[PDB]
Amino acid sequence: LETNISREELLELGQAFANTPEGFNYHPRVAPVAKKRVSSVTEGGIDWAWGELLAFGSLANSGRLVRLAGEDSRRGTFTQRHAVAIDPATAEEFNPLHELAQSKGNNGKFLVYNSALTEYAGMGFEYGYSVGNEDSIVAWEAQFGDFANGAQTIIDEYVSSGEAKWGQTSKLILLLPHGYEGQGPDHSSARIERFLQLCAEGSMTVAQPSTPANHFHLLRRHALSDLKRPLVIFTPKSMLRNKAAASAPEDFTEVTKFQSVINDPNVADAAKVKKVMLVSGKLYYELAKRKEKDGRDDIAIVRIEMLHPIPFNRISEALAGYPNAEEVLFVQDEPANQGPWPFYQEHLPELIPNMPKMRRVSRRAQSSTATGVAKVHQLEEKQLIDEAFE
Amino acid sequence: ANGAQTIIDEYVSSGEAKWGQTSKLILLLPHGYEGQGPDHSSARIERFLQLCAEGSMTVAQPSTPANHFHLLRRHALSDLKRPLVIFTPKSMLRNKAA
Amino acid sequence: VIGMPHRGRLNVLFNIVGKPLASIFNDVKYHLGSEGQHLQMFGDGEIKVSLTANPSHLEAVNPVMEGIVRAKQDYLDKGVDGKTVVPLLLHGDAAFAGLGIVPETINLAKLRGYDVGGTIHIVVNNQIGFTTTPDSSRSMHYATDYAKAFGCPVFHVNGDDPEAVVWVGQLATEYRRRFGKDVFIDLVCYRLRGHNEADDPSMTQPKMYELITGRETVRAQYTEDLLGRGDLSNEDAEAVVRDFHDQMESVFNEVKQKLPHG
Amino acid sequence: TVVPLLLHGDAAFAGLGIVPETINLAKLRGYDVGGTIHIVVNNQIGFTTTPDSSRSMHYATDYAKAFGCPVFHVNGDDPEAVVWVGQLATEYRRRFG
Numbered sequence: 001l002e003t004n005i006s007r008e009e010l011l012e013l014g015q016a017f018a019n020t021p022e023g024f025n026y027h028p029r030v031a032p033v034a035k036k037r038v039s040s041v042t043e044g045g046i047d048w049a050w051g052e053l054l055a056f057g058s059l060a061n062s063g064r065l066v067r068l069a070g071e072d073s074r075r076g077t078f079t080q081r082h083a084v085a086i087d088p089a090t091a092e093e094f095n096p097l098h099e100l101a102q103s104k105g106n107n108g109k110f111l112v113y114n115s116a117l118t119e120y121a122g123m124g125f126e127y128g129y130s131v132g133n134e135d136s137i138v139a140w141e142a143q144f145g146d147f148a149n150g151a152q153t154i155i156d157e158y159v160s161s162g163e164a165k166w167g168q169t170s171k172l173i174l175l176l177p178h179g180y181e182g183q184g185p186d187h188s189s190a191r192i193e194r195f196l197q198l199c200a201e202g203s204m205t206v207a208q209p210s211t212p213a214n215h216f217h218l219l220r221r222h223a224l225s226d227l228k229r230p231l232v233i234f235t236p237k238s239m240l241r242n243k244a245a246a247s248a249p250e251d252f253t254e255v256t257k258f259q260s261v262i263n264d265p266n267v268a269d270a271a272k273v274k275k276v277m278l279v280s281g282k283l284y285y286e287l288a289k290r291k292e293k294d295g296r297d298d299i300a301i302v303r304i305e306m307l308h309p310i311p312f313n314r315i316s317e318a319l320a321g322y323p324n325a326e327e328v329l330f331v332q333d334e335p336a337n338q339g340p341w342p343f344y345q346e347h348l349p350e351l352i353p354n355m356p357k358m359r360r361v362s363r364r365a366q367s368s369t370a371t372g373v374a375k376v377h378q379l380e381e382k383q384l385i386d387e388a389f390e
Numbered sequence: 391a392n393g394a395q396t397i398i399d400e401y402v403s404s405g406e407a408k409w410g411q412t413s414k415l416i417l418l419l420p421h422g423y424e425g426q427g428p429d430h431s432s433a434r435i436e437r438f439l440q441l442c443a444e445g446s447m448t449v450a451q452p453s454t455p456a457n458h459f460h461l462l463r464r465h466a467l468s469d470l471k472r473p474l475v476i477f478t479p480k481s482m483l484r485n486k487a488a
Numbered sequence: 489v490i491g492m493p494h495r496g497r498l499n500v501l502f503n504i505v506g507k508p509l510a511s512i513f514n515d516v517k518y519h520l521g522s523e524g525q526h527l528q529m530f531g532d533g534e535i536k537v538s539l540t541a542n543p544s545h546l547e548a549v550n551p552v553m554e555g556i557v558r559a560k561q562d563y564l565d566k567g568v569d570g571k572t573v574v575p576l577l578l579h580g581d582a583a584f585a586g587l588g589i590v591p592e593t594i595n596l597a598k599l600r601g602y603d604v605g606g607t608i609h610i611v612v613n614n615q616i617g618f619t620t621t622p623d624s625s626r627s628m629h630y631a632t633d634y635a636k637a638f639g640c641p642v643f644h645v646n647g648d649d650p651e652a653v654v655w656v657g658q659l660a661t662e663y664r665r666r667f668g669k670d671v672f673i674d675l676v677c678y679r680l681r682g683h684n685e686a687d688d689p690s691m692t693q694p695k696m697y698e699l700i701t702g703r704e705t706v707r708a709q710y711t712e713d714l715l716g717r718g719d720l721s722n723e724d725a726e727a728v729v730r731d732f733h734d735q736m737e738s739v740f741n742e743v744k745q746k747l748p749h750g
Numbered sequence: 751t752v753v754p755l756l757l758h759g760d761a762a763f764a765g766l767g768i769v770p771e772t773i774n775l776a777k778l779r780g781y782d783v784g785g786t787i788h789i790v791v792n793n794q795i796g797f798t799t800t801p802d803s804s805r806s807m808h809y810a811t812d813y814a815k816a817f818g819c820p821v822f823h824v825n826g827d828d829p830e831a832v833v834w835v836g837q838l839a840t841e842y843r844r845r846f847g
């Protein structure tokens with residue numbers, strides 16, 4: 001299945017943020033975001049929020065009903081989405097991607113709502129939407145993935161187990177912000193370990209993409225396929241505005257499929273690498289920065305974009321490309337009893353028998369998810385990257 | 391008990407590490423695979439053991455009434471101010487060999 | 489015993505619980521618990537004041553705080569006419585109406601093993617929740633409408649009239665001691681700044697923030713109101729302002745587990 | 751034109767917080783469905799627990815007064831009165847949403 005969009009369709013989507021209705025003007029802090037969306041589709045520098053909206057928008061143009069709901073989801077928790085803009089003078093609302101979809105002639109819709117302060121009812125409502133209309137694309141977003149434990153009954157009893165129990169399928173998308181940035185125990189972990197503990201028989205797809213274009217292709221592959229199973233995506237916070245994370249337009253128009261594993265872009269000679277680091281998420285960019293600063297041509301950093309199912313064939317192909325590798329390190333921000341390490345330490349060695357013994361590099365095991373002191377977090381992050389390289 | 395996940399994650403399993411606040415709460419959670427279905431079989435042991443680190447809480451599944459007696463009494467008469475999670479039985483309540 | 493979220497927590501620690509400035513300042517502080525004492529200026533009564541620890545998950549402290557109160561009441565053991573540990577529980581308007589744990593905990597108020605003589609609820613109703621307005625937060629007329637389900641009274645009071653606010657506080661505490669039931673105070677106020685540091689609240693709510701930006705504070709408005717009606721003299725009004733600057737100057741420079749072996 | 755008919759038990763309706771948390775979505779823009787017809791099979795017991803230990807509300811259905819909605823308590827041993835209440839409740843939902 002090819003998930004790329006035409007160059008013409010990409011420019012049309014970008015031009016929707018310029019087709020403002022008669023007598024409508026943006027708020028001056030939202031105006032440069034809209035202006036960058038029109039420039040990005042030819043120049044590049046496409047951020048996470050725009051990569052995600054390019055996917056929801058393209059699907060609505062084909063004729064689908066796209067529904068996105070969550071706390072403060074119109075503007076976005078991190079002031080990044082602006083799917084609905086408001087004129088400060090008249091309080092008039094504008095939804096550019098919905099209007100473009102309605103003008104294509106296939107009755108496509110892009111519906112974005114601000115939910116009430118609820119997780120149990122909120123998520124439950126969106127799971128129900130997916131069951132009442134198989135052909136809709138539905139996404140529930142949490143303020144922070146840490147608050148999804150207040151909807152545990154819906155995760156355990158419907159989303160992760162519905163097909164096995166009753167033969168009832170769903171295509172619900174869970175957008176759960178996750179990332180260790182020093183914001184405390186309730187603003188750092190979406191509990192990846194818990195979601196991977198509920199996975200078996202390919203029950204649901206779990207992913208942590210690192211580039212806006214890969215998130216675009218993941219959402220589009222899920223929507224255009226007949227694999228009627230949920231999609232759990234661990235979305236970023238600081239990586240939303242990282243300049244090294246942005247994508248070029250060719251990543252949406254020339255790149256045809258979603259990538260399970262992304263090989264290292266900065267490798268001069270593959271025969272000289274001796275260490276191989278496996279990582280997943282925003283931590284890649286920090287590790288890559290350190291590799292350039294120190295000039296380490298003996299290390300290779302490979303990203304695992306899809307966590308479940310385990311893309312063991314693509315990981316095997318990547319490790320085969322470095323024939324003089326002596327050790328394989330699994331590097332993550334999360335504590336030793338959390339994150340994707342517990343799942344991968346059990347299953348990856350049995351799926352790739354010739355791979356060397358994996359060595360963990362992470363934060364120490366903890367009762368809580370993360371420290372409450374920001375200075376302690378920065379010290380732990382330095383210790384983590386130092387341990388990986390030495 | 392998954393309808394009380396916020397209390398398990400944010401208070402019982404993490405309170406001492408986060409704020410230095412201790413508790414000696416006993417959770418009595420019936421568990422056992424006896425054929426009563428998906429909502430009458432597992433207390434999700436794997437989830438409780440995923441939250442354990444630094445001896446945060448004591449987790450046990452006793453097999454004899456006397457051992458359950460000694461576990462409850464050791465917890466109460468000790469100065470180890472940490473929670474106790476016990477996976478209690480259903481059919482084993484009336485097994486003559488137990 | 490107080491249960492509350494982050495908004496105004498350090499203010500409550502200094503002016504209500506009575507902790508010294510040096511102890512407060514040495515986001516961890518925004519989740520810890522504390523203890524203090526309250527003496528009355530016009531009386532000879534004393535009362536202990538406690539603050540309970542809580543996570544960032546809003547309203548999760550509600551059942552925990554009630555349980556803390558019941559344990560302290562059982563240890564004193566004063567019977568049916570006792571119930572001398574008062575639960576003072578603070579909420580936000582979006583969280584009070586939206587999260588189900590709020591009415592689930594209030595359902596325990598009259599039950600045999602959970603009764604604590606009633607809870608005083610204060611909803612800081614600033615008519616906003618991050619970027620969400622009440623039209624998308626609740627299907628209830630007022631935020632505090634779960635009170636009508638439990639047969640409890642509600643007092644909606646204007647946050648810019650401090651005389652009416654202190655009266656409601658007294659009446660609600662008098663009602664709790666006489667009837668032993670929950671009481672709900674809806675403090676109708678506003679939120680002056682955005683939800684976080686990097687947020688322009690006029691981006692999403694421009695019309696509401698036309699009325700908020702550049703208005704007199706509750707302190708300044710009340711001083712000017714008393715001086716206008718003749719309730720404060722010109723000389724007496726100048727002293728209140730000098731006292732406000734004195735309180736600021738003083739606060740600003742306030743720098744000077746083992747196993748049972750055997 | 752799709753009517754939600756939701757059945758509950760008296761102990762569960764009063765006790766579990768998801769009940770009023772879901773009813774709070776009834777008038778919201780992205781969640782409105784024209785009203786829900788709720789039936790509480792109030793058999794005045796919940797396993798071995800009586801209403802005196804199940805709720806601090808006079809009636810099991812008292813979350814209705816929070817949302818400004820009408821309540822009809824009907825005697826389950828008078829089937830004429832039960833069918834009348836069913837009709838009136840469905841007529842009220844179509845007229846007021």
Ligand SMILES: Cc1ncc(C[n+]2csc(CCOP(=O)(O)OP(=O)(O)O)c2C)c(N)n1
Nearest residue numbers: 143147544545546580581582583616617618
């Ligand atoms: C259970 C839970 N869900 C979501 C959040 C995210 N969150 C933090 S503040 C906030 C809005 C709070 O609104 P309101 O209750 O009116 O409080 P205010 O900030 O206006 O005092 C939200 C949704 C949270 N902290 N806890």
Ligand SMILES: Cc1ncc(C[n+]2csc(CCOP(=O)(O)OP(=O)(O)O)c2C)c(N)n1
Nearest residue numbers: 393758759760761762763791793795796797
């Ligand atoms: C969330 C949840 N908690 C607990 C139970 C256990 N349980 C099963 S039936 C029951 C009592 C139900 O009482 P009521 O709602 O009055 O229903 P009735 O059986 O009287 O129709 C309980 C507690 C459950 N099934 N679900």
Ligand SMILES: [Mg+2]
Nearest residue numbers: 580581616617
């Ligand atoms: Mg508010």
Ligand SMILES: [Mg+2]
Nearest residue numbers: 759760795796
């Ligand atoms: Mg019943």
